[PDB]
Structure formats: C-alpha cells, structure tokens
TrEMBL record, chains B, D:
Originating organism: Banna virus
Taxonomic path: Viruses, Riboviria, Orthornavirae, Duplornaviricota, Resentoviricetes
InterPro entries: Seadorna_VP8
Name of the protein in its database record: VP8
Pfam family, one: Seadorna_VP8
Lineage top rank: taxon: Viruses
Automatic annotation (TrEMBL), chain E:
Protein name stated in the entry: Vp2
Domain of life: Viruses
Full-protein interval shown: 353 to 403 of 955
Organism classification: Viruses, Riboviria, Orthornavirae, Duplornaviricota, Resentoviricetes
Transmembrane domains' residue ranges: none
TrEMBL record, chain F:
One matching Pfam family: Seadorna_Vp10
Annotated organism of origin: Banna virus (BAV)
Name of this chain's protein: VP10
Origin organism lineage: Viruses, Riboviria, Orthornavirae, Duplornaviricota, Resentoviricetes
Domain of life the protein comes from: Viruses
TrEMBL record, chain G:
Protein name: VP10
Top-rank taxon, per record: Viruses
InterPro entries: Seadorna_Vp10
Amino acid sequence: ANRATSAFLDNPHPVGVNYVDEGSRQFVAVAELLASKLIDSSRESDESNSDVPFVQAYSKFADDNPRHLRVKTGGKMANALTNVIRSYYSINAPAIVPQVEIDRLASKATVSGDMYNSYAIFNSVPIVEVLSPARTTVSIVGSDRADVTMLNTGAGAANITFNFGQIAETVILKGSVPFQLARLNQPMPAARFTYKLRPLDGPFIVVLPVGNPLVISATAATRIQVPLAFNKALVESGFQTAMNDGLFDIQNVNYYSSFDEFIISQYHAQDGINRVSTCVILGLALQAYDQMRRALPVRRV
Amino acid sequence: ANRATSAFLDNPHPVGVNYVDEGSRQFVAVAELLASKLIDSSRESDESNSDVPFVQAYSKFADDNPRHLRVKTGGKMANALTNVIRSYYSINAPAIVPQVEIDRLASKATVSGDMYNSYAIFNSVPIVEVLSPARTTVSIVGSDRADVTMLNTGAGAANITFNFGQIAETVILKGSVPFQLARLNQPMPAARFTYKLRPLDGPFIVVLPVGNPLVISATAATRIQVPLAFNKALVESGFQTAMNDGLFDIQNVNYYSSFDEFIISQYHAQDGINRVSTCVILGLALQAYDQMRRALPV
Amino acid sequence: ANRATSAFLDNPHPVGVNYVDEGSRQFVAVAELLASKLIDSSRESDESNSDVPFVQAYSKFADDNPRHLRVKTGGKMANALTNVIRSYYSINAPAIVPQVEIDRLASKATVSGDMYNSYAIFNSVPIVEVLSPARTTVSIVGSDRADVTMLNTGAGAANITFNFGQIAETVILKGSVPFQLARLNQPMPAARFTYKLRPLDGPFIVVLPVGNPLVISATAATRIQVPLAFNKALVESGFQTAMNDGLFDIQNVNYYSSFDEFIISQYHAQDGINRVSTCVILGLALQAYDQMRRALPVRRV
Amino acid sequence: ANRATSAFLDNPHPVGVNYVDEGSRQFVAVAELLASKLIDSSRESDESNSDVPFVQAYSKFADDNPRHLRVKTGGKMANALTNVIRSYYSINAPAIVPQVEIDRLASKATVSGDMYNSYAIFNSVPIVEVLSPARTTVSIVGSDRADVTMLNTGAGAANITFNFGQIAETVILKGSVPFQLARLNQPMPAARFTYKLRPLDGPFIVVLPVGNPLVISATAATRIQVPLAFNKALVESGFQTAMNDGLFDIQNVNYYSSFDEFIISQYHAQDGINRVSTCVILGLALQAYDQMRRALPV
Amino acid sequence: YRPRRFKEIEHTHGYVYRELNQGSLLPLVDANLKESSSYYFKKLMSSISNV
Amino acid sequence: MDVLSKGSLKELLAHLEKTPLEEAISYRIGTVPYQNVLISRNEYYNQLYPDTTSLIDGVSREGQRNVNGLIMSIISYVVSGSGHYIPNIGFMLLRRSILDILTKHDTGLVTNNLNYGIIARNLTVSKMNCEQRKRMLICFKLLAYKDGNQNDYEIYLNQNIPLKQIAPNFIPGDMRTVIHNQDQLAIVGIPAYRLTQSTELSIRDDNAKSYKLGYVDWYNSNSFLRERSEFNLIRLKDRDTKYGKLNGW
Amino acid sequence: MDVLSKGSLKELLAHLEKTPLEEAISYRIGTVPYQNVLISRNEYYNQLYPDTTSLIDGVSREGQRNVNGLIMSIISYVVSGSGHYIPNIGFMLLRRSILDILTKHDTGLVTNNLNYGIIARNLTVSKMNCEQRKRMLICFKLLAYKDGNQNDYEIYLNQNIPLKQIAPNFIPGDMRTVIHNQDQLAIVGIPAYRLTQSTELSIRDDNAKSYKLGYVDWYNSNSFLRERSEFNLIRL
C-alpha cells in the first residue's frame, strides 16, 4: 500500500545538450590542466618569494599580464568555463559561448578530451521504492548512508519489499537487530546482521516482527566511467563553490546536496546513459572551477 | 514553546590569543613545509636504499643528526609545535614558548605567513534554534548531516520555526516526504522534497501535518579564508591525533568530533569573526603536527 | 503654546575629544595631501598606459609597493585614517591608533597643519524654536531650505514667533504671499514678499491672517574657519562614503543627511565653539578618505 | 489601500545597446580628455596674448585648423560625440556613426576606457511604493529630498508601509515631529526625529497618530561604479545642455530633471544592472559635451 | 638587502640631492618601427660576443 | 571570422561566391532565440548579469524550417559570423553558394512573399551597428532584384530614414557599380586603438570581442595571406587583379 | 620604544633607574577600558571587526588617582610602551624614577595593601604573552620585597600555575641574581630580513607591530633630535 522513496531520486531535471562534442571536451580538459598549474605555481611562488612562477602561469591561463589595480579573475578562460558549467546543469541555461572561443582555448595545451579512460566509485544509496503493508510505517533518511526505520504496529509479521534499482553494483545492508531477508519467492534464511546484495537480483522481502522498530542501514557502490584526471575530492569542493556563487540558480531545476547525489539521480532516469556522459564533463569542469577560484580568490567576508 | 539547538553549537570556549602575529604565522608555515619534506624524504629513503635523504631532512627539522641509540623526537621544533597547539585551543593554556625561539624557527625557510589567500568549504550544519509548539516533539541529530525528526500529537497542523544563523552561505534542506516551507510573511508553496535556502533571509517556517513523523535532513556549506597549503584531509587527521595525545586536555573547555565542528562553533559565538583567524592558524599547525608525528612516531 | 523645531538640531551627540593636538592635525593634513597625489597618479597611469606613476604614489602613501594577488587598501596609513575618523564622530568610539604611528605618518610631508587659514559658507538653516498660538498649526520641513507651513483657524491675526538662534550670520525669508514681519516691540511694516534678517537682532514676529495658508522658505548662511585645502564637494562625498561603509554605526549617536547639518548642529549646542574645531578636522579627514577610496576601490557589487 | 510612488521611477525607457565596446569607450574617454584641454587652452591663451594654444588644441580635437570665416563647430569629433549621445538615450535612435570613424578618433589619445575603477554617490531617493489605509492620504513630492506628507482622519492610528527598494545603500528619515518606525515583525521604538535605515533589511511600518499632519524628509545615498575622470558637476551641466539642444528629443522616451534621477530610475528597472553601465558611459560623454560646447557654442 | 652605513658625520649632518623622476621610453618606442627594426636588430646581434 | 573581415563590397561579394550555404548552417542545437537569461560576468559583478538572447550572435540558435529561417540564417552569418540550426536541408541547397541562394532562380526556394520589416525585427535591427546594418541592406537588395520586388525595397527604405542614408549604392547585376563602391563593411580588423583581453558585458559585445581578438591571432598566424611578400606564390585565380569579375554580373 | 627594546633584566632595571615617572604616565585622556567596540580592518574584512579595549593596548586610557592606578600605569608602560591618564599626580612624584616608586620608601607612597590578583585581572594577564608576563612579574616581585610581602607573592604564583613556570629567577635584594639572569624580555628589536608593512587584527597586535616597524627608524634618527632638546636643560 504505502510507498516510500529517496528524496534525492525524485524528478531529475534535464541536463544540457551543448558543449558535448570532441572540441568542447578538449576545452574542459585544457582548463583543468592549466588550473592545476595555477595552484602549483602559486605554492611555488610563496616558497621562492617571487611572483614570477605565478605571473608566468597566469599568462598561459588568461593570455594577459595582470596590472596591479585590476582584479585578477582568469580572463576569457574563466568567463568561458563559468558559463559552460551553467549550460551543463540544465536545458534552460543560455549556452552563449561561441565556438571560436572554445576552439582557441582548446589549443593552449596538447591534451585529449577522453571521458572514458577510467572509473570512479560513487557511494549514494538508491532506494527507488519501499512498498509496505497498511499497518506498518516506513521512513527513509539519508543519501550517503540510508537509514530505513520501519515499525510494525500490525498484529502479525509483515513483508516489506525493497527496490534498489538496477544501476548500483553492490548494496550492503545492516540492521539494529538481526533480521530476515531473501529474494522474491525464495526461502527465508536465518536472522543475520549483514546482507550483501546484487541490486539486479530482484525485489527483496524483509520480515518485520511485531514489537520494537527495526532500522536498516544501507550502503551502495556504483562505478561510473570518468577521465583519468578525475578527483572526487576536488569535484565536490567545486560543486559547493558553484552552488554558493549562484551558478546553479536556474528556474525549474533540482538542487542536490552533493555531486554524488547529482550523478546517481541522473543515472536513475530515462536516457540516463546519455545524461551521465554530460554529467561527467560537468564534473571535470567543476574540478577546474575549484582549482582556479582557490588560486584567484575574489569574495571577501 | 520548546527550543531545540545543535549540540556542537553550545558554549564555545574562548580560544587562545597568543602566537597570532606575523612572526608566529611564519613559524607555522615553516613547520608545515619542513614536515612535508620529512615525509617525502622518508619515502625517498625507502626507495633508494639509503638513509642520506632522511638524515638531511631530520638535520634541518631538529638541528641535530639522527642517532641509532637516541629517539627521534623532532628536536626543539617538535616541542614548540606541540606547545603552540596547546595555546591555540584555550586561553587557559600556559603559552610558554618564547619569541626568540619562534623567530629562530621561522628563519629556517622563506614562506609568507599569509592566511587569507585561499578558502575552504566546511560542511557543518548550524541549527541555532528550532522553536516548536506544545504537543510537537523536535529532535536534532548530527552535525555533518543534521536530521530533524518532528511529529505532532495535536488536532491541527503546527508551525515550526527554523533558524540557521547568519554565517552559513547555503543550506539544502531535504525531507523524507514532501513538505511545505516558506519564509516569514510569505505564501506557503506546494509540498516538495528539497529546498535550497540562504540562511541570511530570515527564519523559515515548515508546516507539520498530523500523522506520521516528518524527518528532514539538512546540509550546509560555509566558506572560510584559509592559507594555500591548507588540506582538510591532513588537518582532520591532526585534530584526532592531538586529541588522542592529550594536547587538548585543559580544564573548562569543550570537545568536538571533528575540526569543522570546532571552526563553525567558534564562528557562531557572540563575536565569532575574532576566533576564525586563530582557528585557521590552529588548523595549519595540526596539519604540520600530523605530518611530523607520522614520520616520527612516539 | 505649541512649539516646533528643526529635526537636525535636536540632541547633538558629543564629538570625540581625541586626536585634536598639533601632531594629530599634521597627520590629517598629510593624509589629505598624499591622498590627492594618489588620485592624480591614477589619472597619469591611465593615460601613460603604465603603472610607474601609481607605484611611486602608493609607495609614498603606504610605505609599501602595490602587491599582486593582494587587494591594495592603503596599508597602515589607511588603517590609521579610518579609525581616527570614527573617533572624531563620537566619544563612544574608541581610541585605537597609538601616538607613535601618528608621529611617523605626520613626518611624510611638510604640511603646516593650520586649521584657521580660510573660511567656508554653510547653508543649513537653523530654526531653533517657532512658538504658535492655540488655534494655529505649524510644520518645519527641510534643512537646506526650510519650508514653514502655518494655518490659522478662527479669530484673527495670530502672532508667530521665530527664533533663528545666534550663530547664523544672515537669514533670507521668502513667502508664497506677502506677509508682515518685525522684531519685538517694533511697528509692523507693509506686507512684502521677502525679508533679510540678522538672527542676532532678536525673535521675529510674523502676522498670520485667517485662511489662505502662508508658507515661508528660509535660507541661511554661516561662516566657519576651515583650512585652505578644504573642499566642500569632497567632504560631502566622503561623508556619504563613511556612512555607507558603516564607520558611523556607533551606539547612542545621531545621524545626519550631510556634513552641513552635522557642523551646524554641533555649533548650536552648548560649548559648540570647541565642537566645531573637532568637526573641521573630521571634514579634512573625510576629504582624504574620499580621494583615497576612489583611487583604491575595494567594494564590488 | 492607496499606493503612492515616486514620479521619476515610473516607466523607464530602454537605453541604447550601441557604442559600449572597448573601442567606443576609448572614444568617449578621448573626447573627455581632449575637451578638457580645449577649455584649459583658453586660460593658457590669456597668460600670453596669442591664440596659438587654442589653435593647437582645436586642431587636435577637430583635425582641422580654425578659421575666422566660419563658426568653430568641432569638426568630425563634434558630430560623432553628438550622435553617440543620442544612441545612448533610446534604443530607437539610429547608430549613425561608423565604427571605423570611432576607431580613428580613439587613436588621438592613449587613454584606457576602464569605466569601473571608481565610484560616485547618487542622492536620488527611491520610494517604490507607500501603502496606506483607506482613511489616510499620502503625498510623495521630490526626488533629491522626498517630502512625504501623510494625514490621518480616522478614529484610530494607522500603519503605513514604506518600500525603499533593494538598491539604495542608506536612507535617512527626518520627521517634522517625532514618530515611530520599526521593520516588519519588530517591536515599535520610542518616538525619534531621525531614523537611519538599510533598505535591504525589509519594509518599514510607520505609525500615524490621529491629529496634525506628519511630514517625513528622506535622503538616500547610492554608490555606482564610474570612471575616475567622472565629474558629477560637469555631467549634470551637460545633461541640461543636451536636453535643451534637443539631443534627447525622440518618440516614446521619458524625461528627467537631472542625471541623478535618470541613473537611479534605470537602476530600478526589471533588469536595471545592464542599463547602469550604458548610463555611466552617457554621463562621461555628457561631461565631454559640456566642456566642448562651452568652448565652442553654436 | 640593506645599504651600507656611511661615516658618523654624514649620518648626523649629511644631505643629498636626488631626483625622483624615473622617466619613460614611450616617446622613443611610439613610432613606425618598420624601417628602423632591421638596423636595431643588427646592433642587437652584435651586442653578445660571437663564436 | 573570414566573412567579418571583408571590407569592400567586392571582397564580400567574392567571398559569398566561394562560400557554400553549409557554412551558414550551424548543425548545433543552440537555444531559443528570444529569452531573458541570467549570465555570469565575474570580472565586473558578483551578481549574475541579466541579458536577452538574440538571433544576431556568434552562437547557434534554433531557427524556423521555412524559407524565412534560411534567409535569416544567411544574414546572421554575414553580420555575426554564426548561423542558425535549420534541420534536414537537402544536399542540393547546401552545396550551393550563398550568392546563388540570394541571386539565382535555379534553386527551388521561393522568396517572393518575403516581408523586409518582419525580417528586420526578427534579426534585431535596433541592436546592430552601422556596418552590420549595411551588410543586411546588401542582402535585402540582392533578394529584391532576383525577385523583381525592387519597389518593396524602396518603400522599406523610405519608411526608415537612417537606413536610406547608409544604404549601399550598387546594382546587383552590374560589376562596374561594385568596383566604384567606397563603403567600409569590416566588423573585425586590425584595431588602431588598444585592444585588451578583458571580457565584455553583453552577449553580443563579448562574442564580437572574441572574433576581434581571434582575427588578430589569425592575422599573425601562418594561415594569413601576405600580398606584399608572397604575391608570386599565389595561384592565378586567387591573385588580386583589376579585371576580376563575378560570374555573370 | 626604548623600554620595549631592552632584552635583559640588567638593561630593564638600568633603564627604569634613569627614567622619570613622567614618561610612564601620559597627558592624553583616551577612552575608558573594558569596552566592546567595532574597529575597521579593511585589509581582511568588509565588516567591522569586534575587539575589547584593555589597559595594555598601547594607547592612553583613563585611570584613577589611587595607588593602584599609578602601579597599573607603570606596568602598562613596561609591557605596552604607553601609560594611562592619572590627573594631577604632582611634581614630587613625577621627578622620581620608576624604580624608586617600585623599590624605595622615600617616595611617600604607601604601596602596601596591594592585591596582585586584582591588578593582574585589570591588566588582562590572560592576553599578554610570555615576555609581557615576565615583565609584569618583575614589577610584582620588586613591590612585594620592598613592603615585606614575599609570602603574598608566593601565594599569587601558587594560584596561577602558568605564571609560576615562567617566573623570573632573581631576588630583588641580591645583585648576584641580577647579573647571572638569562631571561629574554625584548618585545621589539631589529629583525633579520624585514617584516611586511601589513596590519593585524587585534588592537594589541597592530599596536605592537607599529612599534616593531618604527624601531629601526627610531634607532637611527633619535640621537640628534633628543640631543637638540637635551642641550641647555636640567634633568628632572
């Protein structure tokens, strides 16, 4: 009867369909590589007590030698990168970057826009639906570690069906007390604390005894193809920086607590294979954004 | 009415007021730089089957050659680094290390003591107060992810007031079931799963219907100016080690699970901007402490 | 019976009693001279397409050269100037700058430091007190031009007393319709549009008939000793910048629309002669604050 | 409910989207610089008895030598400056001047057209709306100093809502008699003559006692980024000259008393940020127009 | 870097005449350097001793 | 970029002869033409910068499939350097030159019902500069002569006084008029003023500066053609000659 | 500047012998201490920066005319370089040097009945660094030994363990302890390389930095300017 679902999986907004070609991917890859040099040069400048390494690196990134009074922000490369990031997030984004600028910026470094060289593990738990009987209450909280608290007020033991989707590879389940769980139309095993499940096996049935509530903690692992320069720590920081600076405030879009929740949510949708490819490019662009903004701080408190 | 507040935001103890000048900040930056070279040299020593790289690195850090019979404490720099960490945590710490020692250790390397050339994001959720009417029970659990559980036993729907402070930049607010939330003196919108909010634009009201409890998860991000060499992975490891080593065992102080909880709690004091700079310098010292202690365990 | 007074003349808060000696006055005069050089050097740098003129002026002003990847705010000279401006406004504002810093900064230039070389004319019109009979309504609006609207209902020939104080030099009265005005115990002259009055002559009585509201517009002129470098345009612009930045956000203080109302309100209070001396030094400091802040713009919308 | 607004804030007309590139901005800055030297040449003509300083400056400005036969107009630079001003005011005005001519005129001087290296203070008072109950009458008069006259004829006191917009930095309120103003959902303060407000905080409630009328005088200050060569006195004079000369005579536009009212009105549009940049360039051009037309009147 | 100290008499009573104008190379630079570039390049090549 | 660098009418008309219609089409999805958007301009403001998208831009935009859209995409290519997205045009049209589309009857396009006022509003004319407007009037004149609606061209010019003054003067069928024209139609070129690498606020202005800075790099690249230094290396067809004539005309 | 430059107990005690009490006190009214204020630090933040005014800020503050006010003014001069405003002290006490006020019975001042805990609280001992703490304890020991209150000095040190660790090792009556003392008490001094001309957040930190930066210029250009005034005059 009752149906419960994860909050972050509901209504994934469409992603952009622009700047997804070979030349555009080279522009994103070049930006990440040159932004990395910007951070490294700034550290070296501090150690050597000379601004030459930073001035030299900023000249490659921004194609200009800065003046003292004018604030340093990155120039055309920063402008193009910031607007392209907006275009990836939603369809409604203006997408106002010319192709001449993209081609010129992609020619700064000899790098390849390969977004399928390696993989990464994304630990967000997808709970598509949890179907429960009438006298039982189910609440789902959390995304990185989902805690499903279920209480059986009914007279007899109830069966609750778990649907974790088909994208995730491994889901590990732990409970406050040992509990019974098995696949659809299969014998119930002995009560155990921990289960390791393949989400493709099928809907899973859990037995809820009458009495104290049972809380099941869930953890998932999904593998998504990403470039070899992908760094999850830098991507998350860039995602927060972009959200705070107001680059994602577009009409009719969904806001996610992490890039982990964003990429998994788009995966768990129709044409999700194509959506993930765009989201991966957005991830590397966000990684470039974080490195570039940390080396060139503008906001003051 | 009932008031609920975050545990980590209650009674932030005063931080130390010493070793925050330019000379002392250069000492901390030098300590981090030399500690990083110590870790790198040990790795190079293992790879090349020679102790020459480690001897040079330890000689610069400790001003003495390593010896097989003696123990590798780290020298006077290790003692000074431990003492400044104690003074940073609380104002009741002794703060014994003299200035002539601080200046002599800052002259080992040439690094600026700038602590405002970059920024870092701290994902701690400040919930200053959650005002609740009678018959409604509100519980706040967690700091990195704050889960607020509310249920009403009354006949009608209740209004719950949320205050997230004036420091956090954005707060993303996710509920177990769709719920309505709006600012003061604003129409209530249709129920929806997620909300993005700026804590600055006044308190927020959430309509709580009668029935099953509503659990709402909060996530916040705050930008604080930090040095370029800041590393949250290293700082958090150093925070745990210093707490394990008793560097923070001073009377009339509070304790925190992680460094981000410490920096947000001190930010939310009566005048929190005073303590942020001192807390930031403490973070860089803990990063140096973590690298040095891993190379030279005791 | 009824009494009316100008809004800006009510409860003038005390001014600071610090940084009023000869050495502090020399510091303010030095700041104004060097801030002017900053503005001209910025104009020269813009025309010459080089940073040489600005670096020389900033180095003299801030004892440090302009720094890349670091906002240029003015260094210790800017910090000292900003804090003394706050101290001049109110006693509640603290005294933070030490005497050693001021003496060091006062030695940069060779200014005289005299505060009584010249004069300035201020246009704020002081209406200390307007006394009206029981059936007459009186309203005072404005500071640069005061519009006094008076209505008489019933009876006839209500007598309204005007008290313009003793500080103002000349006051000019203009009426919508010709009106009668004369001093105490003097015959009333034929009705005429305008009057020229010396505020020291005494209280002025104006005859107000029934119906037909009569509005009197008053403009005043007051002379205050000021330095030769005093420029009212720069002082007023500096006043607004200081208010916007929050330098005057002190407890138990009064806020004014312009520096004209500030200096006149302090002059009309008790011991106002010694208050004006501090206000003039605040004016010169605000002149330096304006030119320094326009040369270096920190605030970005 | 009666709603009263400032007269100058209504129906801001679209501004021109031309001559805002780097080359065109350099042209306006060159015109300001060369018109300034033209005025100064008159004084340098008086120290001697010759007209060589004026002839020298006119040739630089107009690319032609002055002649006693004809009235000195200004040459190609005068026509370009006049037409560019018209294009700034309205989008319906044609962009007559070619870009090749502008590029040629921009090479006369070596100035850089950076229009965001300074700021200016604008004193127009934005009153978006004043909402009053049925019995009360509210009248708003003036732009530089807003005199709001309110009379209450009902039995009880009235609450009047003031909305000063979200652009002005500070607003100072002075009343004829002491009055009480508090922000929404905040306790009323005692009666005072002067209130200092930050418009971003929220709408303000004013208590109107029954009896004699209450008049409030408002003064506002707004900071707008302008070029360093900006002179507010010179800009205002040029605006009056351009209005008199008929440069602004074009269908479907709004007319303003001063450049203070013009820039604030545009800033308070739906997308007023993009209008302010064009308005600032118009002010610099108007500053050059004032200097040039005074030296060479037609 | 720091300057070396003078004699004690020069520190107590010494004075020096200095000019703070640094100048500019733009008047020489700002020209049509097309024809003079070849002559300047020949002098440039001769400045460094040749193998 | 190459089209925007053409200064004379002879050079522009020669370029439209060589260039096939496929360069006017973009093949990229773009976005909706007229839409109020918030863009990021961090060099000037922290707050997002409001702007309105338009057809005359350096980026692809969605265009109508009819003959009206095809004409508009050609004009947008000439005045802005980038065309529109018109899906599934036949290969016969795409291989034809731009000049053939505007001035020949062999193509199957029917343009007799074209309204010049509607097109001028869609390709916003109040936003174009003088050189862009001159290029548009060249395209309108070529369409009028092919269609016989030369009167409709004149009535349109009489309704707009500034356009009539700056209207290029040539006969679309006589080459002698083209050679005599002294009009300058170069949107991008070598700048006499100082051109920096800073960004601009509006989408049109920022996009135009990208083309301006790109041309300077293209000017100093090896692809640029220097007549005074390599004139003997040029093919006889592409060498500058006084007797060069367009096909027909 | 001269007092903060002394780096040894011998030099500090020698300086206090040659310095009259006039230099310790100041004639500027200043402001009342212990006030929560907002100051401007535009180097770092756009908003105003909170701080609390203290007696060791380095800026003259109002003080009472009792014995405690005079002692607090002396200690502030030693640790911050500037004293407080005590109205109308009198010529009799102004001519006396600082050490005689601290360690002599001929000044006519009753320095007994002095509470070191109250004085330490008023001087914000929790905010001063090791060198400033050391200098404060030196003044306390001199006062205690002159009035025969060595027990009260020991009681104060026992209650404050952090101050007991860094207590000075000299005995006021013995000269051998003074000469062999190895304490470092130099707040300011000529530094190797240089220090950036940048502001600091705290009132104490910024004022202390202003003393360090100006010490180099004061060191080179003080002898002639002081001599011009010293010539043709009699010392107090």
